[PDB]
Design a protein around this ligand. Structure first.
Ligand SMILES: Cc1cc2nc3c(=O)[nH]c(=O)nc-3n(C[C@H](O)[C@H](O)[C@H](O)COP(=O)(O)OP(=O)(O)OC[C@H]3O[C@@H](n4cnc5c(N)ncnc54)[C@H](O)[C@@H]3O)c2cc1C
Ligand SMILES: Cc1cc2nc3c(=O)[nH]c(=O)nc-3n(C[C@H](O)[C@H](O)[C@H](O)COP(=O)(O)OP(=O)(O)OC[C@H]3O[C@@H](n4cnc5c(N)ncnc54)[C@H](O)[C@@H]3O)c2cc1C
Ligand SMILES: Cc1cc2nc3c(=O)[nH]c(=O)nc-3n(C[C@H](O)[C@H](O)[C@H](O)COP(=O)(O)OP(=O)(O)OC[C@H]3O[C@@H](n4cnc5c(N)ncnc54)[C@H](O)[C@@H]3O)c2cc1C
Ligand SMILES: C/C=C/c1ccc(O)c(OC)c1
Ligand SMILES: C/C=C/c1ccc(O)c(OC)c1
Ligand SMILES: C/C=C/c1ccc(O)c(OC)c1
Lengths: 550, 550, 550
């Protein structure tokens, strides 16, 4: 195709046309689409942000290209370096609340790795790992284990939804809820296409599999990996793996992710905390238990509107347009059999071990008046606990998508700071965020996900995407929250395309030493600045800061 | 001082003299030493390799410089960039078996960070972490916890000896034996002086501590850290921390290391395996247990000569000059009440939990004929179990230094490949290594340290450092082992100065893609190539490969 | 001399020594001083900041050099470009509250232009202007006019003290209180030594004086100026004069400043405003009057503690260590016969004209209850009005120096934002600043100086320079005020050395477009970055931002 809505920087329409003809001959007309529709979670869009906080077409691809295999990504990168065409690689494109599949720089080709590079490459039982391509979603990996009956020996670790990409999510350093919840720390052995187009394998993946007749003459992408590749992630020398997470330093084509053995015993549970103020005592209680491993997985503390929004839109609970009152939150809590805060967790391992920990957990949460303990069986058929019971054993579900429908044309945007695992800090973060949410006219909706020495506080901002006034309030909100949390010593761990610059500007100790160093690294490996310029605030030097920053 | 034995590359005697007068005025004559003695573990040398496999003066400093603080490192870096003088930073300089304090390039200044930058900067109880400077040895951190009575709340994780540096060891990705044994994975928040001399803090350390009257006007090195700096290592954007382990990308001035809470119950144990061939069954047994966490710490599988060498030199068991026979190893085993292989481990937590796991461990090791189970009380006063009982609870000891005295002027050199956690692989690596040791005329001495999905096999080569014939056999051995292990799909995780190029050459998948990328990074950040050139085989472009590689 | 406390960046001791011997042979040993004392207003220091907010030696010269004439500055510039030595030019060095004579970069040579380049070059009566060198203080220019009896034809315009430099103050865009109070707007024709060392004259000064026998053979610095040089500032083409105010783009050697003709009638006056809240009504009143020119000069609105501090230290009014209360300020007001706010002004011209405006002023201020009107005769012998009566007619005094002695070892630091000429805005800025001063534990002390469409609000922070705790609170205060005022839409017009980067960061519309442009200009004209690097936050490219910004 001939004429796109937006062309990448400094590129002419003829270069665009030459380039797109070049890619079409490499991958076929069925794997290329020129943009000359927000869609669904089911068939995500790959052209722009479906949960658009800015105008819909603000972050817009000029074309979508689907490589057939690693060789095609090498050729595409060569082309982009020839024409200076920025690429924006995506795996599944479901980064909802974070920009979706939209590029930071409009005019970029969205590189759709996941359409054709789909394979579950290996599932290794003795080493309890899997190797995967960008296109394997959590649902797909689950089906792979089920079809081969591997569920009895190995379990997966999934986020709240099941359509996301195992590799995609892990390179963003996403989180899950079993004891393998720290996705990025469970990796070992990644394959990357560098900006120069050279293939590179990290860790023990750089120690080549010894030659043998059966693997002679295979292209590098197609070679097997040496025995320790997916078992010990460090290899030898500088450990460069992290340069590839939340970065623009390369295109990840394959990754090994460690899988937990069936634990031989499982029990999910829900602890309802009656009062809004019970967050403080609960976190204080969670601290020592999470450090000493009575709390085995990544347990969450859900605010009552998160659960309420899973079960029904705002219209179903109130006809109010403004934020529900405190008294109304107590009525919704009572209506659903939940507290104002709901703690979700799971015990793993043999009964004798589950028993002891469970009594420790129970006994410690008993200092909170009115606490109530439930197992999935004890709750209604449509409960969040019955969904999270599946979630905390690695089974993918889609039920929790429903909270995005809290409002009319509900879109999501995530404010994601990190808090200490302390009631004092958690209340304070809450207090800060709640106050700005109410100034903005939005219900506070959020969850804390409990890590070992930190909690990821996901404030779920939901707004009407067809309401220009509220979109502007969301943007006012997000920007102020960033600043306020920064003034209180808290940083966000992951964000949307429009907030990357502002969030990187917050990590400016010693006059921005941290981004300068990233900048130095980036321009050495991408001298044409073709790999997703702007991702995380890191700009190659051909992208003036005055022009491009937000 | 005026005239060093060796000058760094391309530097004149006059530039050397100017430089050293420049350093003397910054740090004082007491903190600078010109080299115009192997020493002890007690007072390590900082001029060369005390366990010299090459000639003693092969790797030699021109001078030793001890910065007083971070400002001094900054100024020293500026001078090195002015004169193009290569710096070799050390923390404690006890990297015995790995080159000690010796620089890869002779003529380099050895930067002694540990003499004056010694401080335990902070021990945080609620967050269960500590922040430290290069000079805090494990023994020092231990004493710090004892003086303040923190041992009841927090434990350390130590390597076999206690004199090493907490930071030094951790940036080498060193290993320990409690559940916090993956030293590098326990870090969060590092401070680094870049090659350009700029101070940088990683992760959440880049999110500055909010201003307040009490901290106004403090030099950047002296500023407090924001609340989440030592609690969540990822921060935001590219996770660049790993670029600083086993690298020459920076000079680490401070690091945060997560500390394990007193577990409320501890019991070490020893499981003796009668036969040489029992390794295989044992590892096959260890696999599922380690994966399902019945084995909580990093348990080890010591070969009988390791324990034997701790208890007495070779002269005490035989007057032989050649390797002890198999029949002799069985006699030494019997004499000491140990098997041919000895498995050391520890159970953590409340009694009810220790009980269940201990029965699971017992029962699974029972499939090996003649297995015997000991607690420290059950063994003699000089046993390795009573020493390692301390070691698996983070208490520092120095007893295990005695195996370096197996031979007359015993020096150590470590051959450190990684193996799958499988009887088959472990036997095979053992077979390969044992064969080459006997060809070399040396006793096989070693340990396997059990990681989750891998084992670190430390073959401990001990030789007479005053025996030129054997030193040459050591070098013949090491180099052949590298190749043999590489030809069987195994790579080493850490190595000595003289083997770094050969070991990086082994991680050459796709025509050395991994080292080219490291080179690209290094020359961007060190355009004068003044930070430890050659470390891990990574050479700045001013250091011709033909000239410098070994 | 041989060994300075601090050397400029990247310079060796030997280059320093060579350089200083080179300068000594150009200007003599009497004109050069190596720094191997805070002093007084009378004999200002030229080595560091006498009103030090940071440690005393924080901003420190390596040497002081006093050029004999323009040729000497040219040669000094050549040497600095040869050695890359940063120069910090000063005229008188009395920039008290703004860093004094201290360089932004420590190690810089302080260039003392005023010691030897002292001359009143010309006082032209028909054109009502004067031409001056860096060393002509206002007191000196005053004496020059008196000696020749020119006071009857021409008046000066002075700042609160008389020792400052006419040129120095003017290139800082300093303010005065007659109708000629916008010092920078009264200039026409400047002479500058560029960074490359070339002499340049601006405006009509670029149109050379026609040749004539009497001026043949004169060095360029010594040539007369063409007739219109000091009469029309614009010249032809780009008007580049402003690139030389509050900048590091050149070294100003001579300037022409327009002088007001004796007005043929003068009467100063004081209007006391009883209440703290009367600021608002007063400013609302001042607005139309200032715009329609009933208020002819630059009238000021002094806070009661400013006048109180001129008359006696804090010990004389209270023995309190904390801020005086509101009730105490009313008592001090009553004691001195002043309001809580005191408006000082002056009427110029023939009696008939003074009469009419004076009735217009009186009548409009009459809407404020309790207002009282004084002429100098009506007040006591030690009043501020009798001092400012002199000040509003261009006569230099030193009386107002006494407010710096409010506290024990009182030092001054100025927080200088701009406010709209509106009661609403003025109160609001006052509210913001007063709140932060009380949190800091300091008395609020300040003045508003009334411009045509804006007011310069000088918050005069006075602190004990030997009190480390309060110095830190001063720094905490200053930095928070900057941010607070920025968050309310107000920027500072001038600042001290330690706040320059933070204040330039505030003028960051469109991703700092304004400073990028300044950077581009500066590196073209100073490729060695030797003229006052860092002045106003503008850094030559050899000065890494990470390293140098505060
Ligand atoms: C209701 C809801 C719930 C969510 N719950 C969770 C949760 O529990 N945990 C969680 O972590 N997230 C959660 N998310 C956030 C996000 O939706 C998921 O993390 C999702 O899996 C991320 O998208 P993806 O991995 O499918 O898609 P992708 O669009 O592939 O996103 C990948 C992103 O990482 C980079 N990237 C991806 N692939 C590559 C590659 N091959 N090479 C280089 N860079 C690459 C790019 O920066 C890109 O923007 C949730 C979102 C919603 C809407
Ligand atoms: C008998 C014996 C037993 C051992 N047992 C163990 C064991 O169980 N586990 C284990 O891991 N090791 C073991 N070691 C190996 C090694 O001796 C220890 O890891 C020791 O702690 C490493 O030295 P160090 O950390 O004190 O000293 P250092 O000499 O400080 O070594 C640090 C090294 O890392 C780098 N480095 C250090 N500090 C910095 C800095 N500030 N900035 C930049 N780079 C830096 C340099 O490359 C340097 O060579 C053993 C050694 C012997 C002789
Ligand atoms: C009690 C008190 C009251 C004050 N009242 C006033 C007031 O009413 N109005 C006011 O404006 N200020 C006031 N000031 C602020 C300041 O003290 C005066 O402006 C003073 O005249 C400025 O110093 P200077 O001009 O003598 O000295 P200098 O130290 O000469 O300062 C000149 C500055 O401008 C630059 N500069 C000077 N000469 C040159 C040159 N030749 N070439 C290039 N750059 C040059 C440099 O950046 C330098 O730092 C006051 C200060 C105090 C302590
Ligand atoms: C809703 C859940 C959720 C959303 C975004 C995230 O990043 C996340 O992980 C920390 C969890
Ligand atoms: C002997 C013990 C030992 C030596 C060197 C090491 O590197 C190590 O840990 C992996 C352990
Ligand atoms: C006190 C008076 C004062 C101080 C500093 C200034 O800059 C100023 O003029 C705007 C006035």
């Amino acid at each position: 195709e001939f004429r796109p809505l937006t062309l990448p920087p400094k590129l002419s329409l003829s270069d665009f046309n030459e380039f797109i003809q070049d890619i079409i001959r490499i991958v076929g007309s069925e794997n290329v689409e020129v943009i000359s529709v927000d869609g669904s979670y089911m068939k995500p869009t790959h052209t722009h942000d479906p949960h658009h906080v800015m105008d819909q077409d603000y972050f817009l691809a000029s074309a979508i290209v689907a490589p057939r295999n690693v060789a095609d990504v090498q050729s595409i990168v060569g082309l982009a370096n020839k024409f200076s065409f920025p690429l924006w690689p995506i795996s599944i494109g479901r980064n909802s609340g974070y920009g979706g599949a939209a590029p930071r720089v409009s005019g970029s080709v969205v590189l759709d790795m996941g359409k054709n590079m789909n394979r579950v490459l290996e599932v290794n039982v003795e080493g309890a790992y899997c190797v995967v391509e960008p296109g394997v979603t959590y649902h797909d990996l689950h089906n792979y284990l089920e079809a081969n009956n591997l569920r009895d020996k190995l379990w997966l670790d999934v986020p709240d939804l099941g359509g996301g990409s195992v590799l995609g999510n892990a390179v963003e350093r996403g989180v899950g809820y079993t004891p393998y919840g720290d996705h990025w720390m469970m990796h070992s052995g990644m394959e990357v296409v560098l900006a120069n187009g050279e293939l590179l394998r990290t860790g023990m993946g750089a120690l080549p599999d010894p030659k043998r007749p059966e693997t002679m003459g295979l292209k590098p992408e197609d070679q097997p990996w040496s025995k320790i590749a997916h078992l010990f992630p460090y290899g030898f020398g500088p450990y460069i793996d992290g340069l590839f997470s939340q970065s623009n330093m390369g295109i990840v084509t394959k990754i090994g992710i460690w899988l937990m053995p069936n634990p031989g015993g499982y029990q999910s549970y829900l602890i309802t905390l009656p009062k809004d103020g019970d967050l403080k005592q609960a976190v204080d209680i969670i601290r020592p238990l999470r450090l000493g491993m009575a709390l085995q997985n990544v347990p969450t503390i859900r605010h009552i509107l998160l659960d309420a929004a899973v079960l029904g839109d705002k219209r179903s609970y109130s006809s109010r347009t403004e934020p529900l009152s405190d008294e109304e939150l107590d009525k919704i809590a009572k209506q659903l059999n939940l507290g104002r805060w709901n703690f979700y967790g799971a015990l793993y391992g043999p009964e004798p071990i589950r028993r002891v920990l469970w009594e420790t957990i129970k006994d410690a949460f008993s200092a909170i008046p009115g606490v109530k303990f439930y197992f999935p069986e004890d709750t209604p058929e449509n409960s969040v606990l019955r969904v999270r019971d599946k979630t905390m054993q690695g089974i993918p579900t889609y039920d929790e998508l429903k909270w995005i429908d809290w409002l009319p044309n509900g879109a999501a945007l995530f404010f994601s700071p990190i808090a200490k695992v302390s009631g004092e800090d958690a209340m304070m973060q809450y207090a800060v965020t709640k106050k700005r949410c109410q100034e903005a006219g939005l219900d506070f909706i959020g969850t804390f996900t409990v890590g070992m020495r930190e909690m990821h506080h996901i404030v779920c901002i939901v707004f009407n995407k067809k309401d220009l006034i509220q979109k502007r309030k969301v943007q006012w909100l997000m920007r102020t929250l960033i600043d306020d949390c920064a003034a209180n010593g808290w940083g966000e761990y992951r964000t949307h395309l429009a907030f990357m610059d502002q969030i990187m500007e917050t990590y400016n100790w010693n006059n921005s030493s941290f981004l300068r160093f990233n900048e130095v690294l980036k321009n050495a490996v991408d001298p044409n600045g073709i790999i997703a310029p702007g991702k995380s605030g890191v700009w190659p030097s051909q992208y003036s800061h005055v022009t491009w920053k937000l």
